[PDB]
């Protein structure tokens with residue numbers, strides 16, 4: 001069947017911010033380069049994948065404090081102003097990008113394109129939850145965030161693929177367990193989960209996660225190849241029985257607290273309390289509020305992008 005497309009909104013509109021010139025502006029002079037690029041990406045995806053179901057996954061909290069509680073360095077270098085309790089921290093975002101996110105969200109709401117979020121969770125968690133739950137159609141997760149390669153799945157069906165944006169949407173291809181295993185050396189039979197365990201061990205500087213000192217990606221791969229899983233690796237270390245080297249034992253035992261804390265940080269949540277802005281995840285074939293869509297698109301200088309999206313929708317069987 002047609003795939004359901006699950007879109008990592010922030011990954012995509014950050015990409016369009018940096019991929020479309022800032023001289024693309026609304027009639028009031030505000031840049032709309034990210035708005036244009038993001039709407040154009042939806043149209044490209046609709047044409048390429050021909051989905052019947054599409055969801056733009058939101059970051060109701062781009063840096064959940066429950067992750068920060070576990071590893072305080074998590075995303076810390078990207079915070080402009082920390083906010084207390086459940087108020088999301090102020091992310092360091094260009095001043096001319098923040099209004100464009102508001103424009104995008106306004107357009108999506110007026111059009112009736114499904115968006116989904118979960119309070120105190122990232123879009124990453126919405127994606128993992130909607131991917132894990134899906135029972136009817138193959139899933140395509142659209143993102144440039146490599147940590148989401150942990151979602152790849154073949155069985156149990158339906159399959160999950162990541163349309164990885166690291167080189168842009170035009171060059172993007174679909175990653176499954178095979179591709180993740182081939183590129184990161186994790187075992188095929190549990191490539192997605194093993195990828196998250198490799199990423200935990202080796203670290204993720206972009207997310208502020210140091211990893212385990214002395215266990216780089218090569219060592220992490222060989223230990224997963226030999227012991228199968230992170231849990232088995234820790235077992236081998238806590239257990240003078242095994243053929244684990246004393247050096248690897250020391251490095252792992254010296255990081256038991258970090259490893260336990262990082263597991264829940266690195267893994268996307270799969271049971272997040274996702275809610276939708278729409279009654280279903282069906283992609284509307286025309287704007288739910290066409291007058292408001294036309295007025296917003298004119299005000300935001302993306303009338304032709306919206307028109308091209310409606311042409312893409314019109315060609316769906």
Ligand SMILES: [Mn+2]
Pocket residue numbers: 065082083084085087088089
């Ligand atoms: Mn906070």
Ligand SMILES: [Mn+2]
Pocket residue numbers: 124145147
């Ligand atoms: Mn992420």
Ligand SMILES: [Mn+2]
Pocket residue numbers: 010011122123124145
């Ligand atoms: Mn994210």
